[PDB]
Every structure is written in structure tokens, then in C-alpha cells.
Design a protein around this ligand. Structure first.
Ligand SMILES: CN(C)c1ccc(C(=O)O)cn1
Length: 330
């Protein structure tokens, strides 16, 4: 089997991407944030504290003839941006782009933090990291991908995120029309539960490539590119007037600037992130100070190849017995 679904930016900055997902019988369609950095499929629901729901579409398990309470199971998760959610668990039928999994754990939120409430466009998350990170207790649950894998034509999914445009998540096949040149594959460590890999270096604009190993994670649920402070300083030094602002919470730059590209290495191959992709717009409405799309990972403990990086590539998440990542230009 295979599946193919369009993923759409939630706003004009590509702050996140949402993908429609069918849950239950009859189908209830929710728009979920596909997150290769976590491993829980959770949704706003009829159980979510009413004051914490503001415009989201909810899953109502009592209206699904295939929903079953997973008795005794609870979940609770916190994300790198400080947001969080928790609740109980149902199993139900879940379909993405025509690919159906029966008995998928659907984690129903009883509580969500303010940043979830405030984002009316995101109805929940669909985790695509390794199932070892799943938070359900006392019986850990599998991701949608793990549950689907054995049935797929090939044990893979691909992320093809758009810049200020829709893109595609495919399951079970590689669309050879969706990229240019060849796909370069690179080793993955699953030791931390992430799609963790090592970039071979970087370049800023038309500058020379610096060969240096940068360990990090391919994370579709993180907006920006978070890299070591040395790398990030080298980038922003090429933008007149750019500076790190402790008050804003990262590098800012004059909105009048033209940003240089940023290249990252995948083995001997190179992925080029156009300068425009690194512009996250005014820090507040009407400001001439703009927020940068490349930020330091120093506070975080891990480097993160978030959407800024991934959207410049066609990315293969190969879930074969020994997982690997693939990157192609597009
Ligand atoms: C809607 N918000 C608060 C989100 C969504 C997704 C993530 C994440 O995948 O890490 C974090 N915050």
C-alpha cells in the first residue's frame, strides 16, 4: 500500500504545516502537524478542557463506531518550545492520504498549553519519530508509520515541504518526479529516538564550504534551523546590522536586508537554502527588525534541521531495518 497527502503552511511565514487526517468511522477529518521529532498522535477532542479549545476541530470518539477506549492508558508530552499536552487514549482507524491503519493509538487531549489553544489551525500532532519516544503509559504505543510499515510497498515516508506553498507527505514510495538529480543517503542513529544524522559541513552565501561534522535531527515539527553558535555567528556576520537580541530571543536583522543563502552538506552532496527561506518577518507588527530563520542551538542540547532546512530538499525517511535519511535537491 501507499498514501499521499498534501501538507499546507498554516500562515504566510510557514510557521508550521498541516496535513488532513481521517480518524474514526464515519471519518472525522482533523488537520494535524506531522512531526518527525516526536512520536505521539494526539488530537483536540470532546474531552479537551473547554476553555482550552479556540477554533480547533475536535475528535469525538463517542461518534466513531470503531473507537475503543484503551483502558488505563494516559499520555503527557512536552515539546522543545515549552508547549505541552496530556490526556487519555483511544484506538481507532486512521487514514492519511488513502493509507489506512486500524487500531492506531489516538491520544485524546484533556489539557493543552496556551500555545496550542492559540493556534486555531492545528488540531493535533502526528508523530513520525521512533516509537521508543511515545509517551503512552503504562503500555507504550506505536506511531502511524510503524503501524503502517509492514503493509507499505517500501518502508519509507518522504517529506516535500513547500516554501510559502503546499507540499506533500508520501508513505510507501519515492516519487522520482519530485526531486532533481540523485538522492544522497546518510546514516541515522536512533539512540535518542530521533532521525539523527551528521551533516558534513556548511557554506554561507557564495563562500567556501567548511567541512565539519554537525550532528542533528531532521525535525518537521520545528520551524527553524538550529545550529552551533559558531556556525550561526558566521552566517549572520554576512548580514549588515544583524545581531543577537536577548530581549527578542535570537538573531534579528534589518528587514531591508537581502539574506545570503545557507548550504549544508549531506555526504558529498550539498543542499542550498535560499536566503528568502531564512526571513521570518517583522518581530512584531510594523517593526523593521526581522526574525532570523537560522538560530543558535546552544540553549537546546541538540542541533535541529527544522523546516527552514527541510523545505529546501526532498527528504526520505527510510525506516528499513537499519534506518537512513535521504536528501535531494528539488
Ligand atoms: C502549535 N504548537 C504550540 C506546536 C506545534 C508543534 C510543535 C512541535 O512539533 O514541536 C510545537 N508547538
Amino acid at each position: 500500500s501507499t498514501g499521499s497527502a498534501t501538507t499546507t503552511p498554516i500562515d504566510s511565514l510557514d510557521d508550521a504545516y498541516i496535513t488532513p487526517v481521517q480518524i474514526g468511522t464515519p471519518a472525522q477529518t482533523l488537520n494535524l502537524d506531522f512531526d518527525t521529532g516526536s512520536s505521539d498522535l494526539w488530537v483536540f477532542s470532546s474531552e479537551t478542557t473547554a476553555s482550552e479549545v479556540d477554533g480547533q476541530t475536535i475528535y469525538t470518539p463517542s461518534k466513531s463506531t470503531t473507537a475503543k477506549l484503551l483502558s488505563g492508558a494516559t499520555w503527557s508530552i512536552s515539546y522543545g518550545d515549552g508547549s505541552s499536552s496530556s490526556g487519555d487514549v483511544y484506538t481507532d482507524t486512521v487514514s492519511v492520504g488513502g493509507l489506512t491503519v486500524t487500531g492506531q493509538a489516538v491520544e485524546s487531549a484533556k489539557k493543552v498549553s496556551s500555545s496550542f489553544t492559540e493556534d486555531s489551525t492545528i488540531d493535533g500532532l502526528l508523530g513520525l519519530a521512533f516509537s521508543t519516544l511515545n509517551t503512552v503509559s503504562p503500555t507504550q504505543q506505536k506511531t502511524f508509520f510503524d503501524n503502517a510499515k509492514a503493509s507499505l510497498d517500501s518502508p519509507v515516508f518522504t517529506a516535500d515541504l513547500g516554501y510559502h506553498a503546499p507540499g506533500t507527505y508520501n508513505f510507501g514510495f519515492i516519487d522520482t518526479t519530485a526531486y532533481t538529480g540523485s538522492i544522497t543517503y546518510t546514516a541515522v542513529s536512533t539512540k535518542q529516538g530521533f532521525w539523527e544524522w551528521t551533516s558534513t559541513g556548511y557554506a554561507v552565501g557564495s563562500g567556501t564550504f567548511k567541512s565539519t561534522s554537525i550532528d542533528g535531527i531532521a525535525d518537521t515539527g520545528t520551524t527553524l534551523l538550529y545550529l552551533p553558535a559558531t556556525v550561526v555567528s558566521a552566517y549572520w556576520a554576512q548580514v549588515s546590522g544583524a545581531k543577537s537580541s536577548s530581549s527578542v530571543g535570537g538573531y534579528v536583522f534589518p528587514c531591508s536586508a537581502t539574506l545570503p543563502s545557507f548550504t549544508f552538506g549531506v555526504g558529498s552532496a550539498r543542499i542550498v537554502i535560499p536566503g528568502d527561506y531564512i526571513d521570518f518577518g517583522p518581530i512584531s507588527t510594523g517593526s523593521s527588525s526581522c526574525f532570523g530563520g537560522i538560530q543558535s542551538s546552544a540553549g537546546i542540547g541538540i542541533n535541529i534541521f527544522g523546516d527552514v532546512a527541510l523545505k529546501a530538499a526532498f527528504v526520505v525517511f527510510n525506516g528499513a531495518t537499519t534506518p537512513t535519511l535521504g536528501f535531494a535537491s528539488k
